[PDB]
Amino acid sequence: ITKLQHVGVLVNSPKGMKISQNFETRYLILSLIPKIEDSNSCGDQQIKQYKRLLDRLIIPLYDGLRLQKDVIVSDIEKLKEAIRDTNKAVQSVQSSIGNLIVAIKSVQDYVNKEIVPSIARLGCEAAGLQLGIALTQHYSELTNIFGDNIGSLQEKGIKLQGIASLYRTNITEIFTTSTVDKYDIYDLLFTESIKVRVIDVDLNDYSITLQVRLPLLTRLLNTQIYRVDSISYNIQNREWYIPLPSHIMTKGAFLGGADVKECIEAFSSYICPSDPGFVLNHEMESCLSGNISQCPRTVVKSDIVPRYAFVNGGVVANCITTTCTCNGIGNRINQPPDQGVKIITHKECNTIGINGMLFNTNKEGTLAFYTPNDITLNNSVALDPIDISIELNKAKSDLEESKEWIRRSNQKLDSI
Amino acid sequence: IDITKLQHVGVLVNSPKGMKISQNFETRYLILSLIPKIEDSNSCGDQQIKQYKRLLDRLIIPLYDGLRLQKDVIVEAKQARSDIEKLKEAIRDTNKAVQSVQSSIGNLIVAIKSVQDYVNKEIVPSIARLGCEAAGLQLGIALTQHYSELTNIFGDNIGSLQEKGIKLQGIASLYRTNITEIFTTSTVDKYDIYDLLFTESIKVRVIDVDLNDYSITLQVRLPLLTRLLNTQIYRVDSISYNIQNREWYIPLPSHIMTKGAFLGGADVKECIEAFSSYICPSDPGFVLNHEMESCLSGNISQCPRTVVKSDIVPRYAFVNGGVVANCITTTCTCNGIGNRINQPPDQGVKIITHKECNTIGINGMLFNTNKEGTLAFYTPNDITLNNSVALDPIDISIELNKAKSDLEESKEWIRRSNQKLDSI
Amino acid sequence: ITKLQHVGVLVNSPKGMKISQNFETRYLILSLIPKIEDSNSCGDQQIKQYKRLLDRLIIPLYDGLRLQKDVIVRSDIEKLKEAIRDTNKAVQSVQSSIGNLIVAIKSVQDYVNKEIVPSIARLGCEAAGLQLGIALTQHYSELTNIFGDNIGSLQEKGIKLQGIASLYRTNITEIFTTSTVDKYDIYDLLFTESIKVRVIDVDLNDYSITLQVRLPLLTRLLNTQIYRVDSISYNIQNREWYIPLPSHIMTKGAFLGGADVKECIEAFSSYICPSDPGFVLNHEMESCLSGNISQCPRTVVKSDIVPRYAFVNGGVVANCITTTCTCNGIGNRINQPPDQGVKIITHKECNTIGINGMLFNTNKEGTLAFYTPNDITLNNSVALDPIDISIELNKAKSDLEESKEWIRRSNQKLDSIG
Numbered sequence A: 001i002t003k004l005q006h007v008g009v010l011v012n013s014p015k016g017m018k019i020s021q022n023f024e025t026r027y028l029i030l031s032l033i034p035k036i037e038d039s040n041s042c043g044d045q046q047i048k049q050y051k052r053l054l055d056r057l058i059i060p061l062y063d064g065l066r067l068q069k070d071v072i073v074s075d076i077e078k079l080k081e082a083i084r085d086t087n088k089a090v091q092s093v094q095s096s097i098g099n100l101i102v103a104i105k106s107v108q109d110y111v112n113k114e115i116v117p118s119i120a121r122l123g124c125e126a127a128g129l130q131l132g133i134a135l136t137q138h139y140s141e142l143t144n145i146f147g148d149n150i151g152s153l154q155e156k157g158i159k160l161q162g163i164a165s166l167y168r169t170n171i172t173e174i175f176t177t178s179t180v181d182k183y184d185i186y187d188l189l190f191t192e193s194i195k196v197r198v199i200d201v202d203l204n205d206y207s208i209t210l211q212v213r214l215p216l217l218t219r220l221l222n223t224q225i226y227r228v229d230s231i232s233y234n235i236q237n238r239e240w241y242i243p244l245p246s247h248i249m250t251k252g253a254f255l256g257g258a259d260v261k262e263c264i265e266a267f268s269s270y271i272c273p274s275d276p277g278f279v280l281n282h283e284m285e286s287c288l289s290g291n292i293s294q295c296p297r298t299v300v301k302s303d304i305v306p307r308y309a310f311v312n313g314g315v316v317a318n319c320i321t322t323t324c325t326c327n328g329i330g331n332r333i334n335q336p337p338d339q340g341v342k343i344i345t346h347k348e349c350n351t352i353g354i355n356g357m358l359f360n361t362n363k364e365g366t367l368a369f370y371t372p373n374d375i376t377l378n379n380s381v382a383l384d385p386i387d388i389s390i391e392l393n394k395a396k397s398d399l400e401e402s403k404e405w406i407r408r409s410n411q412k413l414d415s416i
Numbered sequence B: 001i002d003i004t005k006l007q008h009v010g011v012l013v014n015s016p017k018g019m020k021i022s023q024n025f026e027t028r029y030l031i032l033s034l035i036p037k038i039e040d041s042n043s044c045g046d047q048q049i050k051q052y053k054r055l056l057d058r059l060i061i062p063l064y065d066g067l068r069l070q071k072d073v074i075v076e077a078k079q080a081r082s083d084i085e086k087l088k089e090a091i092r093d094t095n096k097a098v099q100s101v102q103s104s105i106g107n108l109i110v111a112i113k114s115v116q117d118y119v120n121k122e123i124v125p126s127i128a129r130l131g132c133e134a135a136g137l138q139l140g141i142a143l144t145q146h147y148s149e150l151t152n153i154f155g156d157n158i159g160s161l162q163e164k165g166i167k168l169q170g171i172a173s174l175y176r177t178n179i180t181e182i183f184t185t186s187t188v189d190k191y192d193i194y195d196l197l198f199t200e201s202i203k204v205r206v207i208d209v210d211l212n213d214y215s216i217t218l219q220v221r222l223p224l225l226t227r228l229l230n231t232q233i234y235r236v237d238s239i240s241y242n243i244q245n246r247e248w249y250i251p252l253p254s255h256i257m258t259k260g261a262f263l264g265g266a267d268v269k270e271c272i273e274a275f276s277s278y279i280c281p282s283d284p285g286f287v288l289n290h291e292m293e294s295c296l297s298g299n300i301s302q303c304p305r306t307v308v309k310s311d312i313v314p315r316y317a318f319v320n321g322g323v324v325a326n327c328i329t330t331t332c333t334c335n336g337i338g339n340r341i342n343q344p345p346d347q348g349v350k351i352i353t354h355k356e357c358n359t360i361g362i363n364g365m366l367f368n369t370n371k372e373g374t375l376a377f378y379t380p381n382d383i384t385l386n387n388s389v390a391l392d393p394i395d396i397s398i399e400l401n402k403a404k405s406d407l408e409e410s411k412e413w414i415r416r417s418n419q420k421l422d423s424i
Numbered sequence C: 001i002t003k004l005q006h007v008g009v010l011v012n013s014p015k016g017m018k019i020s021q022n023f024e025t026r027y028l029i030l031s032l033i034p035k036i037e038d039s040n041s042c043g044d045q046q047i048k049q050y051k052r053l054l055d056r057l058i059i060p061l062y063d064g065l066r067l068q069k070d071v072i073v074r075s076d077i078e079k080l081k082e083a084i085r086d087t088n089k090a091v092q093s094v095q096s097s098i099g100n101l102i103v104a105i106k107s108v109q110d111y112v113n114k115e116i117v118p119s120i121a122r123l124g125c126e127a128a129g130l131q132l133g134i135a136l137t138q139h140y141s142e143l144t145n146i147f148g149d150n151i152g153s154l155q156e157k158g159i160k161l162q163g164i165a166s167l168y169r170t171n172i173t174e175i176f177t178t179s180t181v182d183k184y185d186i187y188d189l190l191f192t193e194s195i196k197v198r199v200i201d202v203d204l205n206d207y208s209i210t211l212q213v214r215l216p217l218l219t220r221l222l223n224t225q226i227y228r229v230d231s232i233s234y235n236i237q238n239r240e241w242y243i244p245l246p247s248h249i250m251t252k253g254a255f256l257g258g259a260d261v262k263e264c265i266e267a268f269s270s271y272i273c274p275s276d277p278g279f280v281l282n283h284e285m286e287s288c289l290s291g292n293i294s295q296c297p298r299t300v301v302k303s304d305i306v307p308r309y310a311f312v313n314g315g316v317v318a319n320c321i322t323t324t325c326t327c328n329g330i331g332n333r334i335n336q337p338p339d340q341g342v343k344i345i346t347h348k349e350c351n352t353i354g355i356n357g358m359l360f361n362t363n364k365e366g367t368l369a370f371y372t373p374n375d376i377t378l379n380n381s382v383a384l385d386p387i388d389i390s391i392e393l394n395k396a397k398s399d400l401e402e403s404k405e406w407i408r409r410s411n412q413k414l415d416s417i418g
């Protein structure tokens, strides 16, 4: 193959080829509910809910798997009575205290029979809740990664975060049987060739078993696949055009056309189920190879034949039959008899125009943001600590006085 | 430029549609922040933030590693005898009785102080903590939701190096009110952006991940469609037809193109059918051969027809809901095996409408109309909240009342005590 | 059709054919917010929040549909009393204390009643709220998984198993409710995700989404069979030939032709086309494919581009005359009588078939892998040892009982005056 632009054919993006036939099969077990242990069974009510949620997920995948399997397979006396009085007075101050004690005891038992237990329960409920958040973030994450896999019983690609559960810290380690290039796995990701299919579901453990099949690419020696676009071209005052296949191949010193219908284009090569090459008729064969005298050219008489095509950042066109402008509809672009087409470059003309149609360079837009609302956690609800010191301090202060008077009553009681 | 006389020759050209080329793009960055600024001086949600960040790490890291791999490949006292000693003693005893009572008070004004301490040093901070753990939970839910929402909208993009389309809710952050503000660079039709949505032509690739601030950076590529002036595209199906007792069929491309006054075929292969038009990277058209072109333009006597001898050649086709068959070499039964629909040896084919015959018949096969089935629902089970009932308050009044009730009765007696003591 | 392996054409996997034109429309109603019954409005905020979340999800779908419809349409007796007055003043001071105590006590009570009890209930409320949020959050999560792909585009999309889950109750057959469908037919519908659902209408007030499920009804063509065919360069005598043929072939009754399965979708037991994909081949080829092998449009090969080997049913078919086929190692070459056109290499005959050094092995199995969540263990609530003052309280009655006795004593020493 050469440079037969002068005849309107443009061969570009040269690329290698690999055949995907061999593969490694690993199985991945998804466990939907973590081993949960809570002594007092606080997170009990919640576990129950999280399971009914899982069932709504698992059960359908089950019924489906079962269907698939189903098909496939009177003076002293005054002082006397004055004592009796004061005495009866002390006896009542007793029953008084005898009641403050009961009152005080009742308070204790309240605090123990109601308040403390409540505080307890509340915490239990809140421990349970804390678990709900946990399970929920799990179900969330679970579904986001293997959600499309758990939804169909057919093969599917696998997200990066799903592959991340196959290797520890080096993606290469995904293949635990062979050794693989950094390069080779990249072609796998960019192509999403790694496929996953759900094989079974255990309704009791709440686990889904997936079968992933990793392709092992076989590289091909000396094979290159190019893309080709043909445009009309002028020679003297006549316009010609050569229709050719979309892709050309090169195996050793042989060339032919490549049918990439079933393949997938990777970064530096195409990964195919099998060699895509096919033979062209001697004419195209010689034309492409160099003997330009053989090109299957046709005189163009219809507006249908394309007179321009886009190639790697820029346009290729027949500027004789198509009006090519440079940076405005007033700057006509010439093309010497020398060639059959002109390669207008965006470096050359920022806005290259073809028959009025303006083709510019990617225009940056205004930056966008996906942002959540700022959350401020207005702390709990505070309670002012109770204060009785002022009262208790007086009780203890009267108390003392009481003692002093008794002290005095005794030294006065001294009359020997 | 195409005569629909072609119909009489079993060749049907479906609906007309325009064509647009996609070569002008509008790059535009979208920054995803997976964690909001959080304010809580008491650090009551520290444990959740931790939990949340770890959740994001599991999600983000793989995207990160993948981008790195790509970036790499690419680039006792005496006793009382006399009654005055008996009084001295009698009162000396009561003093001790009082001294006992005051001993009892000391014990109570300790029992109370202990309560004022149990409550203050334990019942309170304990309750305070519940609210603090509860604030954490509040933030968890929220944070959990932001994740669930984020993963839904961008989870398809976040999980691949390959380019993907944006969901409606994704695009939602590219405009404030009109879905048009989508493009900032240019001005675009309601029609032009509808073809974009309907086709999922708007695509985005993840560019960089920032593991520290927990943010992903997407590049949205909005394409700008160039409408190809006076170009239409039709889909074309061909059936067999009878003309003078001979049965013919014409093999024709799937699609045809109309450019000005020229015509040919359309290789829509690498293109995408939208609503108003097809959207292709380049012009799909190619040139048919003299015979075929002429045939389609009108010179019906040029059609590369063939005699049907096999049963492979289609004798009917669905187009415009209804059916179009060759009712001569086929038996078209209108509304039930009974009534047969006839076709003069003159015409080419018969166009049967589901309006005339509710259930078209073609040799046993009954092509009917969409039949509506039973309305179905996806509804969550009704929820009801049973806020814990309040706690019957504490009542120690009956006890406090008798308590004060006596304190008076006591004061009384001391009056009488002081009374008799005053008449001495 | 036959056994044309002798000329290098390999007719693979034989499948039947069904066309899909008869559809069964069925509407599905998505309710994003369930009916909530909260008497004391404990979950108010949490609900206002969830809705704010459903809006950031619904709205866009709305704005989207709008754009669409918008476009589509100084003695002893004197001494004795100075001492009793003293005693009384001491009893007075006691009463004063008992008062400051009776006060302090009610105060305690009031606090627990006017500040703690309430505080306990509020906390109880906040939880009921938080519990609702868990629910709502989950619902949102579950629902965005099932229909989130549909809700995000306005083009038709397939439907997940768990999505189909709400069309039937027990048998997956009750999916269609206007006809009766083979278990076989729905499996082809599932295996193909032919069932499509398109978002029809959204309601911003009741937070609901209406979806239309399009359920295809397959019609089966008789005696029709579609085969996949591969062609490889063969070797007859010392000359090397190649016969190029279409990728798919069809068999109808006693006739055969090609098949343009392009617009078609291969299922399990058959292909599901929007219409019969058969076309006729030129006499020569038609004849060739039916036995008359002297009619095969064979071409002499002179390039390495012509396929000399092909993958088939977990094995390889190759021209081991123009290709160097090795069985179980590069030293063991496989031969071929100048007669047969090609050799059918089986992985059972060759664990590792090698074509020109390129190795095609059996499939090895890597290590089982696990996606498991860290073990969660709940450290119970926060427990408070109960309050205990029964010690200090007993030291109270006891002292009163001592006091009671000191009085009983003081009385009798008086009961003996005279």
Ligand SMILES: *[C@@H]1O[C@H](CO)[C@@H](O)[C@H](O)[C@H]1NC(C)=O
Residues within 6 Å of the ligand: A286, A290, A291, A292, A293, A294
């Ligand atoms: C070009 O091809 C023709 C036909 O095969 C041959 O006769 C002629 O000599 C060739 N000339 C070149 C360019 O080698």
Ligand SMILES: *[C@@H]1O[C@H](CO)[C@@H](O)[C@H](O)[C@H]1NC(C)=O
Residues within 6 Å of the ligand: C283, C287, C292, C294, C295
């Ligand atoms: C097919 O082969 C027969 C003999 O098997 C031969 O006589 C005949 O000419 C061939 N058919 C055609 C179309 O000529």
